Amino acid sequence: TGYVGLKNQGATCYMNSLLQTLFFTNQLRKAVYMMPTEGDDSSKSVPLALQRVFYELQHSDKPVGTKKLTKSFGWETLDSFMQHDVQELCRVLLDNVENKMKGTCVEGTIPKLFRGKMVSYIQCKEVDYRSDRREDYYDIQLSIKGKKNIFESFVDYVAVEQLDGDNKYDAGEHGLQEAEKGVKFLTLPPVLHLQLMRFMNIKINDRFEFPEQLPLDEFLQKTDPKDPANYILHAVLVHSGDNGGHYVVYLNPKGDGKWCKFDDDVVSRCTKEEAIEHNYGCTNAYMLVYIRESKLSEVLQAVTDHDIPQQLVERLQEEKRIEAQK
């Protein structure tokens, strides 16, 4: 295919799979390329290290290396990747970029793409007291045990939990109260990152199905008729084994349904079934990326070589020059 892969270089684990996921989030990729890293240190700037890994995956006829990126955000102990989990690596990457874009023509791009909003609420049954606290979110964590498919997870996720018995709610002035607490989606981000809670640690390999096409209007408190909350499957992040483990990701970068498996240094076309149903559950998904139907075409906009400023290309090329002292 057109696509190049990332070298295996450590217990980097899910890093390689997550790098491809962010790379084919094209609208991100092009914003990342607009960051002004011109004056930045070549060895300890994460923004500059995302630019290079992105640049390389757009230009490299050979597998791309990530040693410099690893070294930039400094996860360099023996259990650095073992100890953390996927959302965490992405928050380190996205928060670096988000901050680096502030005061550029591409400010707010990370929140625009990834940020949804949520209300968490507790209501006393017996007495008149109610707490409501809005929340932003960049990623949602879905429960998997006792759930057969994503819809049950989402249903479980908006479930009303009962605060009764010894587990009653402390309602301040009103004493210990019988109460209902739960969560509601006020909005859903153009790009929807979901984590399946398979680690409880131990790895549950149970059966859990997710759709090619994911309609989530019934989870919104207010359904927009003009922009219905329908999602398209984009990446399927895969682990096989335990403690043991291999990582790969499945992508259809264009949103079109022509899938490839991204297995580090090698990239290969595959069936939808390999990417979707074959990861339902030792080879199973732990993270899903979905793009909203209305926003598919902006997010997966075309990326030309000219979309990279030549100041950057010169810097990077220069770097490549020295390094090439073989």
Ligand SMILES: CN1C(=O)CC[C@H](C(=O)N2CCC(O)(Cn3cnc4ccccc4c3=O)CC2)[C@H]1c1ccccc1
């Ligand atoms: C087997 N195994 C190890 O030996 C070491 C860590 C390893 C791992 O790569 N992880 C990244 C992906 C995950 O982050 C998914 N996830 C995300 N958020 C969660 C929030 C709350 C509750 C659970 C979760 C959760 O499981 C897990 C940790 C883990 C693993 C476990 C399940 C699948 C694949 C690999």
